[PDB]
Design a protein around this ligand. Sequence first.
Ligand SMILES: Nc1ncnc2c1ncn2[C@@H]1O[C@H](COP(=O)(O)OP(=O)(O)OP(=O)(O)O)[C@@H](O)[C@H]1O
Ligand SMILES: Nc1ncnc2c1ncn2[C@@H]1O[C@H](COP(=O)(O)OP(=O)(O)OP(=O)(O)O)[C@@H](O)[C@H]1O
Lengths: 566, 577
Amino acid sequence: LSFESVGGLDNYINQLKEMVMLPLLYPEIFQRFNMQPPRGVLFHGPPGTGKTLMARALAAACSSENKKVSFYMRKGADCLSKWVGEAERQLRLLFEEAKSTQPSIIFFDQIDGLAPVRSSKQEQIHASIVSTLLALMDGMESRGQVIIIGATNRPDAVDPALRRPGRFDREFYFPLPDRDARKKIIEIHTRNWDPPVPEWLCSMLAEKSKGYGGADLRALCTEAALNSIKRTYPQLYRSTKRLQIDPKTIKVKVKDFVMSMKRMIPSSERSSISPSKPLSPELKPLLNEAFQDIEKTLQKLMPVASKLNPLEEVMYDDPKENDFEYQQRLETFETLRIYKPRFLICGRKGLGQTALGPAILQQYEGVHVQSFDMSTLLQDSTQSIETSIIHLFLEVRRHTPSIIYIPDIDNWLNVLPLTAITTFSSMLERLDFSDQILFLALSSSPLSELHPQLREWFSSKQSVYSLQYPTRDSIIAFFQPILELIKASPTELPGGIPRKRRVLPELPLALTPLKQLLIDSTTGFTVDQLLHLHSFLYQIIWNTKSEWNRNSVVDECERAVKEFMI
Amino acid sequence: PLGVDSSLSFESVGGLDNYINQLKEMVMLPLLYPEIFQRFNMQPPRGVLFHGPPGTGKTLMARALAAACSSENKKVSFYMRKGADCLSKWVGEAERQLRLLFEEAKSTQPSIIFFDQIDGLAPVRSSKQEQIHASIVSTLLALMDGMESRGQVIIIGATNRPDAVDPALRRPGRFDREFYFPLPDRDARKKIIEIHTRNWDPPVPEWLCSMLAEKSKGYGGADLRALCTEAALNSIKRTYPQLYRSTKRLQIDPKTIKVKVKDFVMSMKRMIPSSERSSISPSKPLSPELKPLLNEAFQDIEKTLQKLMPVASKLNPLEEVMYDDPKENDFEYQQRLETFETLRIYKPRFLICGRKGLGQTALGPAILQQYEGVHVQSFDMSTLLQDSTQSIETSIIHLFLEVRRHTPSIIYIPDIDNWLNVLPLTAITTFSSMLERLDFSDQILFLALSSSPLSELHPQLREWFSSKQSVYSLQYPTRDSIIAFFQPILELIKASPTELPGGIPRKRRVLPELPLAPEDRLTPLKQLLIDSTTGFTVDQLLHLHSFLYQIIWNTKSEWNRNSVVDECERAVKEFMI
Ligand SMILES: Nc1ncnc2c1ncn2[C@@H]1O[C@H](COP(=O)(O)OP(=O)(O)OP(=O)(O)O)[C@@H](O)[C@H]1O
Ligand SMILES: Nc1ncnc2c1ncn2[C@@H]1O[C@H](COP(=O)(O)OP(=O)(O)OP(=O)(O)O)[C@@H](O)[C@H]1O
């Protein structure tokens, strides 16, 4: 498994192949420069993302070389016992034995349980284990060629004196795979699968996922395998002994995947709500004209161009790299292009925004979002609201680029007390004018009457977008799938045929006028009520899903519309 | 492996020279000259603490002392010791191994003892903890200085937090002396970047040191070696990208790995210092695009702050005595000297105000960087309400107990008008109940930059300062300063093709295989930029300074200028409305 069954994390592999693989085959290249090359890593991130996978793949891609790189394991707090001087005696002969087998690695795991923050508010035994392990990582004599690797979820409860250079000195991050890391993950765990899956749905299964992560994508593919067995042999669930069965007659088809997509929740959505979903396809030919102008405007206010791996960036050539100037020109153009970006979707009540906000918020992959709205700002009663505001700002300031997102800003100013509006408005000006954070907001009161604090923010005419209601020569495309359904129904719709019952073997032991009428009857409607007509006459199609005569339903759905204006 | 050389004798230590001389007065010169110590009939003392933030030179000062005495001349002996190894399961042997230790050292009369991470060994004697820890400190309290003299054994301790040890151990006679390594400030980083590059065959030029000293603002001694070993490791990646993507040795000419300049500045973007992993330092220098708008006002505040609290740097005591003493035996010439530079200061306070976006939040955290050797902590909203466990008043108490420690320091509060509208009234009184009960001579400041301008401010501020010399009001930018601000833009509008770094695209590099081993319309625009911008504050000026760079970014490589002016007027024509 020599680094082949790990997808997406290409950049950290080349940074890892200089600590254990490349002082060892080229020792003379480190003796000109008189250096250590360093011996510490630290892994941190959200749960289920490929953390302990790399520490297993690394110790499997070293023993297959006959170079004899021995290593060790830990299981959290495991050098801890009831006797007095026992808890430190293990840590002496752990590092002692590691020296006498000189090329050696040590893997801790969940180091939060072992080394907390030193304070006088706890027992004294947790101070001695921290103070000892801090001391023999670099004493006044060296520790030999010993590489230390740790991992945890919350990288803040470890002691800050244990995060110095010389001890850990290299922090990584596994940020919940974005778009096409999921394309490679879902093709690793479905490798052989003898009628092999084509490319045209592996690019489709990636797009439906928006935050499964590397631990849930294996559970998606292993559930669709279990759904395929139930399709071909239902007799297996109704026995106790073995049966004469034959493999190599089961094929994972498309239906086994999509029925496994519907009944599975991912890992990070079981507690929270995760506000992002794409546009509804029935809603598409009414808002995509207004959608593209917003996506084109946001490129100017925050360019979010991707990151290149360094081995594909140094492979080019460049003639003039000696001067102190022209080095302060590459990142300078990408620095003052941005200056405090902000945006709104203001307009009338319900003609837009509530289905257009989370359409934008699922495009950016690249990022880390938050939500400063209700139901997450006051959903606990232990702290105040002036403390839960500060805790989110401490998170959004790291892991740039980021997005602050508030839906329904108009009621948001009438509910929070006034000593919390000032606290939120204070932290917006402490951070500098050049970092890459955004500020989305969605209002419902139209222009020239909005609240006098939304004018103190956003301070421009570029960062406000009006939302006028739609363009009569586009509504004839909105009802176009309906008129393709009022045309005759020879069970074109799914239904009408009570299909079949499968017999099982034994398996022994071993149309002109209403189209005009739809036009000069609404003519001023908003989309909030345009869904109502689409959700009214759609019931009329369901009740006539099996009749065979079409000159009569079209008089029903003109009777259905003639009282709706009333 | 490869190892490091054990030939370090007081030369690989930069920026610390006061402590080397005091350390040389304990092991080297009671022995070479014993005849001049009974002439005063004295002890000369034996004992040292080492306390400070992590990674500032505590080891590689104790380590260098052993190599400088063992390689000097015969003979000396020394005992290593880890954190806490002198305690085990059975009842009394934690005290047996300690009594074996000092007895063995006494039989080898010139000797020193290294205690490392002493907080695991001797905590504060209290009844809330199990008393085997109170026992082995008590026998160590009596073994250092008891009924019989211990001999010539010197004790050295290292500590990150110098407050958890017992106060009966810091008595003079047992430890006698405390040091403090203060996170190397400005000029110490010039040498501490120079020692670690005793250097490569293209030796590092002097003009970028100090330039890496200026960019560093709180790295320290540990991570500055990590900066140099990162850029050197980046150079191997440049000159041989075929070193990866293989398994065996290939071929190496280890001479074409000369380090260029670009590897340093690329390595500065990826490194984060050890002090800012959790918190955030409130200091950033002036941005070079903004400097001709504020440089006149920056030196004016600097000139006023020199008379309020002088903080001028002082010297090591060996260089002081090289100046000859004049006729001096009476303490009347020198009793002025302590009366002076004590009564020259009187409650130094300061406050910066004006209209919004007219200066401050930029020059605020800029004077906090230009002078060093002082302690900074921020009484901010993100630091008071940060902890949800304890009360809000206790956090104001626990910071005043810290700033009355070591040095000249600074109480720094941004945006004071958003203050007093968030905190309760019972906390505002408490913070005002500590500024008065400290004396009128401690060198502690009260920096506070503020909102909405003079004669409109609620009067709790107007008795805290209450003096004409301790308030400052900015103004709008003048006419003759604005045309200097837009000068690099209009310079960049002409010299198009080979100047912008987006012109000729970079070509591919070939790879060897490496086998195995055994002015026409310009002045219309120039006059247009004035007579349209007469009353702008300094923050919305930065809008148009940003709105013009997007224009040239789309035109990064197009030729035929005198066709790129026609879009800039309709930009600025939109702005006044
Ligand atoms: N790209 C991938 N391909 C196949 N499996 C993966 C991939 N990424 C993650 N996994 C699965 O995730 C599991 C755990 O990995 P990792 O420890 O990084 O997740 P985690 O969320 O950190 O778990 P924990 O937080 O409990 O340590 C592995 O068993 C592995 O099967
Ligand atoms: N002047 C210097 N030149 C080169 N390296 C230095 C210098 N000062 C300190 N260092 C580096 O600091 C490291 C640790 O030294 P020291 O133990 O004094 O720091 P520390 O903060 O006390 O660490 P700890 O608190 O963990 O003992 C050494 O590895 C050394 O490389």
